[model samples]
Target: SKPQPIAAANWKSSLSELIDLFNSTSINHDVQCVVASTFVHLAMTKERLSHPKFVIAAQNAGNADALASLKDFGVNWIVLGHSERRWYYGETNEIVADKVAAAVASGFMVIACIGETLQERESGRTAVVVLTQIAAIAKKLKKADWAKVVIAYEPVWAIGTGKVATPQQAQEAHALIRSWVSSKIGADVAGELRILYGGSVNGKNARTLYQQRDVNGFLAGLKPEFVDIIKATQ
Candidate 1:
C-alpha cells in the first residue's frame, strides 16, 4: 500500500505560495499537506484557503483559549508538544496535556510530539521518556480519540543537527508508541492511529524512514529546495 504523505511547512509565506508549491509538485492527490502556523498566521491563512487536502495546524498552543481560537479559525490539526516548544519555551508534560485536551475538546486533531534528548537517549531513557509524555495525554483522551491523534517522535539530538535517527532507532520509538496506545487506548484504535517522525527529515532518508512499520508519515522541517521530500517517498 502507498504510505500517506503529510508535509509540514512553517508559517513563513502566504497560502498562495503553499498552494502553488502543492499544485506544482507530484504529491499524491490523497496526501494531506499540513501548514504549521502560529496563531496569527493560521487565522490569516485559513481566511484565504481552507481545503480538506490542505489544512492548518498550530505550531504550539499552550492554553485552552489558544486551542479554542484555532477551532474558530477552522484549523483541523494542532501540532502540540514539539521538542522545540519544550526546549525553547519550557513546555511541561502537564501543560501539553492541557493543550491536547483543549484541542480535542475544540474538535481539532492533534500531532502530539514525544522524544528524548541526547542525554536521555544516552542514559537509555528514550522509551520511558517518550511513553511518559504520551501517557500524560492518553490519560485524558477517550479510547476512540486515538484516531484523532498523531504521534510524532523527533529525537532532539537529530532535529536540525544533521543527525538522523537510524531506521532501527526510529522504528523502536514508533513501535513503543503503538504499544503504549494499544495498552492505554486499545488495539483497534492503536492499529488505526498515524505515527509520524520529525527531525531534519529530507528526501534522501525519507523513503527509508517511511519503510518502518509505525512510521506512517513525517513532519518535515525547512527545506524548500527538497519539496521532493514529500514525493520521493512515493
Candidate 2:
C-alpha cells in the first residue's frame, strides 16, 4: 500500500509561503492530501498547480450547506470529527456521522478522525469512546462508502503540546480500531481502509508511527518543516 501523509494549514494569512512549501523540491516524496481553512483552500485548487501532488481538503463539513460549498470548490477530501470541532462546537458523535455521510454522499473522500481526550484516556475509557464514535458513523454509512473513509486516531492530549503517542500506544489504538470495524461490518471493509496518525507528529517520529499497524499516514499541523514531515514516508 502507498502512504499519503496529510496535514492541515488553517492559514488566515501568508498564503504565498504555503504555495512555496509545496513548490520546493527539497522533498521528492508524494503527498496525497492536505487540509486548508476555507479562505485559502482555493490556493491548492486554483487549476494552476501541478497534478499528482495533492489537493485541498475541507477540514470539516457539518451539514449540507458546507458540503455544497466544498463541492463548488472541486474539493475531493475532508477531515471530519476533529477533537477541536467536537469540543468547541459541542459536536456529538451523531453530528460527526451526519457530516461523514453527507460528505461521502457528495462523492468526497473522507478522513474521519476519532480519539479520546486526555481525561478520557486517563480514565481508561479510550476503547468505549472511540468505538462509540465509529459506531455512530457506521450506523449512517452504507457498505460501499466505507471504502472512501480513512480513520485518524488523534489522541487529544498529543495534538499540540509537542506530545505524540508512543509507537506502541498508537499501534494498540489502531489495532483496536481496525478490529472494531471488522466487527461492525466485515473484515473485507476494515482491511481495505487506511487509518492515519495525527497529533504532534514530528519529523523524527513520523516514520516510526507510520510503520505501526493500521497507522497508514499522517494528519498533522503544517509548517515549514512539513516537507520533511512528509519525507518520512519516502
Candidate 3:
C-alpha cells in the first residue's frame, strides 16, 4: 500500500560517502529499499549496520545457499535475471530461475527480470522472447511464490543507451506480460503482480512511465537518482 521504491547505488568510486549518505541521514517519506554491491552488502549487514527501515537487496549472488548466507547479512531481497547479469556474466535462464526460487525459498523477496534484446525487438520477437524468460522461472515456482516475485521489463537496447520506451511502448509490453501471467497463472494473481519498467528510466521520466496501466514502478538501474525517480512517482 506504500510507494516502496528501490535504489541501487552501484559500485560507486565514492562508495564511502554514498553509504554514509543513506546510513547517516533520514529523509521525508522513507526510501523503501536500498541495494548495495556484494562488498558493501556484507559491510552493511556486518559492520555498518544499515538502517532498520531499509530492505537491503543483493545485486548479485553465487548460489542458492548464498541466499542463506545473506539471511544473516541483513539482506531481505535478491535481484536476479538482470540483463547485465545475463548478458555480461552469461547467466542462463535456468540459472536465473534457480536463483529466484532459491531466494524465495531462503525467505528473501525476489525481483525477477524479463526482457527482450535489441535484435529480438528488431525482429519483432519481443513477446516471444520475454515469455520464454518468464516461463523458465514460472515453472520452477509454486503458486504461492507469486507474492514474493516482482517482475522487471527492460528492453536491452534501452539499457545504458540513453534510450527508453515511450509510455505507450512500455504499456504494450507490460500488458503482454500481465496477459501471460493471467493466462498461465490467474487473473487475481496477474492483477496484483508488480511489473516494473527497467529501461534507462530517470527522475525526469519516471512519472510518465509509472502512469501506464501495468507499469507498477521502475527498477533502479544501479543509479543514485533512484530516490528522485521515486519522488516523481509519488
Per-residue lDDT of model 2, residues 166-227, tens digit only: 99999999999989989888888888777888788878888888777667777776566666
| Per-residue lDDT over 1-234 for candidate 1, one digit per residue giving the tens place of the 0 to 100 score | 434656665552335675556556655545677778776666666665545567778777666776676677666788888887789888888788888877888788888888899999999999899999888988788886766787788899988799999889999898898898888778888777778888878888988888887787787763464466566444
Residue pairs with backbone atoms closer than 3 Å in model 1 (clashes): none
TM agreement with the true structure for every prediction: 0.88, 0.89, 0.86
Ten consecutive residues with minimal summed lDDT in candidate 1?
6-15
- CA error at residue 165 for candidate 3, angstroms: 1.4
TM-score ranking from best candidate downward: 2, 1, 3
Error of 2 at 137 (Å): 0.8
Please list the residue runs of candidate 2 whose C-alpha ends up more than 4 Å from where it truly belongs after superposition: 1-13, 26-31, 40-51
